Design an enzyme around this catalytic site. Structure first.
Site, short mmCIF file in Angstrom:
data_model
loop_
_atom_site.label_atom_id
_atom_site.label_comp_id
_atom_site.label_asym_id
_atom_site.label_seq_id
_atom_site.Cartn_x
_atom_site.Cartn_y
_atom_site.Cartn_z
N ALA A 39 0.85 -1.21 0.00
CA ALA A 39 0.00 0.00 0.00
C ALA A 39 0.87 1.25 0.00
O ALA A 39 0.43 2.27 -0.57
CB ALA A 39 -0.93 -0.01 1.18
N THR A 43 0.48 5.68 -1.57
CA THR A 43 0.20 6.80 -0.64
C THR A 43 0.49 8.12 -1.35
O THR A 43 -0.30 9.06 -1.13
CB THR A 43 0.93 6.65 0.70
OG1 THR A 43 2.35 6.65 0.48
CG2 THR A 43 0.38 5.47 1.49
N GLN A 99 0.57 -6.95 -3.08
CA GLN A 99 -0.58 -7.10 -2.16
C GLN A 99 -1.70 -6.09 -2.49
O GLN A 99 -2.78 -6.19 -1.87
CB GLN A 99 -0.08 -6.98 -0.71
CG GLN A 99 0.79 -8.16 -0.29
CD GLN A 99 1.47 -7.90 1.03
OE1 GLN A 99 0.84 -7.92 2.08
NE2 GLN A 99 2.77 -7.67 0.98
N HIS A 119 -4.03 -10.24 -3.63
CA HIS A 119 -5.22 -9.91 -2.80
C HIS A 119 -6.37 -9.51 -3.72
O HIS A 119 -7.46 -9.15 -3.17
CB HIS A 119 -4.88 -8.88 -1.72
CG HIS A 119 -3.81 -9.33 -0.77
ND1 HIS A 119 -3.28 -8.48 0.19
CD2 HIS A 119 -3.19 -10.52 -0.62
CE1 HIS A 119 -2.35 -9.13 0.87
NE2 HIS A 119 -2.30 -10.40 0.41
N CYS A 130 -15.47 -20.18 -16.77
CA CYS A 130 -14.27 -20.39 -17.63
C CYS A 130 -13.02 -19.71 -17.08
O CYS A 130 -11.96 -19.93 -17.66
CB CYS A 130 -14.52 -19.94 -19.07
SG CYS A 130 -14.78 -18.15 -19.27
N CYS A 152 -20.17 -13.43 -18.62
CA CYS A 152 -19.04 -13.74 -19.52
C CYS A 152 -19.50 -13.60 -20.98
O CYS A 152 -20.63 -14.02 -21.28
CB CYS A 152 -18.52 -15.15 -19.24
SG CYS A 152 -17.05 -15.58 -20.19
N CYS A 156 -20.72 -18.33 -23.12
CA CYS A 156 -20.45 -18.88 -21.77
C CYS A 156 -21.53 -18.39 -20.81
O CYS A 156 -22.03 -19.20 -20.01
CB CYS A 156 -19.07 -18.46 -21.28
SG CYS A 156 -18.76 -18.93 -19.56
N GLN A 221 8.19 2.54 8.05
CA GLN A 221 7.97 1.88 9.37
C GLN A 221 8.85 0.64 9.46
O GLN A 221 9.31 0.15 8.42
CB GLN A 221 6.52 1.43 9.52
CG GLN A 221 5.63 2.58 9.94
CD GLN A 221 4.18 2.18 9.97
OE1 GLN A 221 3.75 1.22 9.31
NE2 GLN A 221 3.44 2.91 10.77
N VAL A 237 9.39 5.98 -0.85
CA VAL A 237 9.79 5.00 -1.90
C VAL A 237 10.06 5.75 -3.22
O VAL A 237 11.00 5.38 -3.93
CB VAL A 237 8.79 3.85 -2.07
CG1 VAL A 237 7.39 4.31 -2.44
CG2 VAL A 237 9.31 2.87 -3.11
#
Ligand code: AR6
Ligand code: AR6
Ligand code: STL
Ligand code: STL
Ligand code: CL
Ligand code: CL
Ligand code: CL
Ligand code: CL
Ligand code: CL
Ligand code: CL
Ligand code: ZN
Ligand code: ZN
EC number: 2.3.1.-
Lengths: 277, 282
Positions: A39, A43, A99, A119, A130, A152, A156, A221, A237
């Site tokens: 996450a 940010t 994630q 996730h 399918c 779908c 299908c 952190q 980052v």
């Protein structure tokens, strides 16, 4: 919901600069580099994290609300999201394990065959019949692998379902399997803005340590697995990744808006490597 | 500093339902096409999407302080990237649809986006800009000038002077820069359209400039998630994320939002680029 609201750590600039050169050194020497994201890499686009000072869970524990500065649809990929696009394009990223459900890696144009979305993805619905996935331009309206109300269209009429895991739901087998294989086979795993608190997602980077792999953790952190890292970088980052790209001699590419790439394109040219020893 | 009235903090957010949002952005498009002289006024809300917190929002600096909590930065000022909104304003100037840009922001992001400084009023100063007390030569630095309140930074003028360099960050008692206020006021008075983006408009005189456009029949548009001081005087109030509003606007006007090549300073506006023909309106 784990350890929430832990104090932030900021490496002083001199130390920050040296660690980013060490990361550069590690990227240059590694055959197989795997990036793990959470996450914290969104940010800087207005999307709050979970366990940071103003994270969803951290704010909930204090009887406050998380604050969004964007919708999911109007979020732009960060400098970090676009650095990962380029690192893959020039062959310096083997695989990317995320994630994040925020859809930003896919919409950045990052190749889906090099991405594990552990996730799920808010823009991605899946046909129960399918298993054909649909990458939508807006968030799919449900969470917990529920019926979205759409069918779908594969040559299908199968029930379409969201890909957002609830607490009880096991990770998608395809994504976890490729994520696990990438992690085991990598000689460098780099973590970006995740606290590594979720099992098994948080544990994948540790698998790289097996047979002498190196671990780098980039996070404001403390993380669950700090003790196991060869290098911990405490800074934003975006700053770490813009310094890295500069050291590697790589431009951060323009985002042409939301674009889905199913398959990784052939590798582009990259700068020659420095002499290291 | 301590007693300073910080205004209405933490008012509830308002979100136009999508149909009303879409209709209002089309009205904004109509206004921009019809207007000879369009002036944009920006505040802290246009930088929230780059990780810089605002002042009076739910999680703003003053709002958080009122509750004994801290604002949260997801960037340094040096690592902040201009938003989709910042870059839309770059293009709107370039194709001659933005006459002038008035900003309360000290975050350096308009300059760093490459927006021309001769079409920009930086009313509250710029964290990256120091000024020589002797000759008034401004220096746009790659890092934040380390002081606030028009203090000595410790560096000297290099003009073919050795004058004391000072930050351009106003303290509470300091009056606005006369050049920036004068050009901002003239822009505002002479505009037939003022568009406000992510400002609550609570500061005098900065927040009052958009009202000057209303004089002699001008139109005022307010884009903001919260109520603003001058909601009653707006022709159009849009309650949504400024990036959603500005992306939909650019789409309606047939304009691409241009790439950011990283921090670049443009002193003087370049000649106007071509733009799409205007739709039939009436
Ligand atoms: N700009 C930044 N630079 C660096 N670190 C950052 C930044 N912003 C935040 N951080 C750090 O980034 C970290 C974010 O950690 P967490 O909030 O646990 O996110 P996850 O992806 O690991 O959560 C995993 C799952 O848990 C949920 O239940 C969902 O299912 C998630 O998918 C923090 O330690 C911040 O210090
Ligand atoms: N993404 C967003 N989209 C739309 N509106 C937004 C967004 N983010 C925030 N807002 C709104 O953006 C608005 C921000 O209003 P204020 O926080 O008062 O900032 P100012 O620039 O007007 O503060 C003026 C001066 O006061 C200070 O003391 C300094 O001197 C400043 O320079 C809010 O109402 C939000 O609802
Ligand atoms: O595992 C998850 C499934 C669904 C969600 C929902 C919303 C959400 C909130 C955030 O602050 C960030 C994010 O990316 C998504 C979050 C986590
Ligand atoms: O008028 C001002 C003078 C100085 C500062 C200082 C920091 C600051 C904090 C924010 O959350 C946003 C911003 O752009 C700047 C703020 C306003
Ligand atoms: Cl809140
Ligand atoms: Cl919110
Ligand atoms: Cl959304
Ligand atoms: Cl806080
Ligand atoms: Cl900073
Ligand atoms: Cl131009
Ligand atoms: Zn199907
Ligand atoms: Zn001088």
């Amino acid at each position: 919901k784990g350890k929430c609201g832990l104090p932030e750590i900021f490496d002083p600039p001199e130390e920050l600069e040296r660690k980013v050169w060490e990361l550069a050194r590690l990227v240059w020497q590694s055959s197989s580099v795997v990036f793990h994201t959470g996450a914290g890499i969104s940010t800087a686009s207005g999307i709050p994290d979970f366990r940071g000072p103003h994270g969803v869970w951290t704010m909930e524990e204090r009887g406050l609300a998380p604050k969004f500065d964007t919708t999911f649809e109007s979020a732009r990929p960060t400098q970090t999201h676009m650095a990962l696009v380029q690192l893959e394009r020039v062959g310096l990223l083997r695989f990317l394990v995320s994630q994040n459900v925020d859809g930003l890696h896919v919409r950045s144009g990052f190749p889906r065959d090099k991405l594990a979305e552990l996730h799920g993805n808010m823009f991605v619905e899946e046909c129960a019949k399918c298993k054909t996935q649909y990458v939508r331009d807006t968030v799919v309206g449900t969470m917990g692998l529920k019926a979205t109300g759409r069918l779908c269209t594969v040559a299908c009429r199968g029930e379409l379902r969201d890909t957002i895991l609830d607490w009880e739901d096991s990770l998608p087998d395809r994504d976890l399997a490729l994520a696990d294989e990438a992690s085991r086979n990598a000689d460098l795993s780099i973590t970006l803005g995740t606290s590594l608190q979720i099992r098994p997602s948080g544990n994948l980077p540790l698998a790289t340590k097996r047979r002498g792999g190196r671990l780098v953790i980039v996070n404001l952190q403390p993380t669950k697995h700090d003790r196991h890292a060869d290098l911990r970088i405490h800074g934003y980052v975006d700053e770490v990744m813009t310094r890295l790209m500069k050291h590697l001699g790589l431009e951060i590419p323009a985002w042409d808006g939301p674009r889905v790439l199913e398959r990784a394109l052939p590798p582009l040219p990259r700068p020659p490597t420095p002499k290291l020893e």
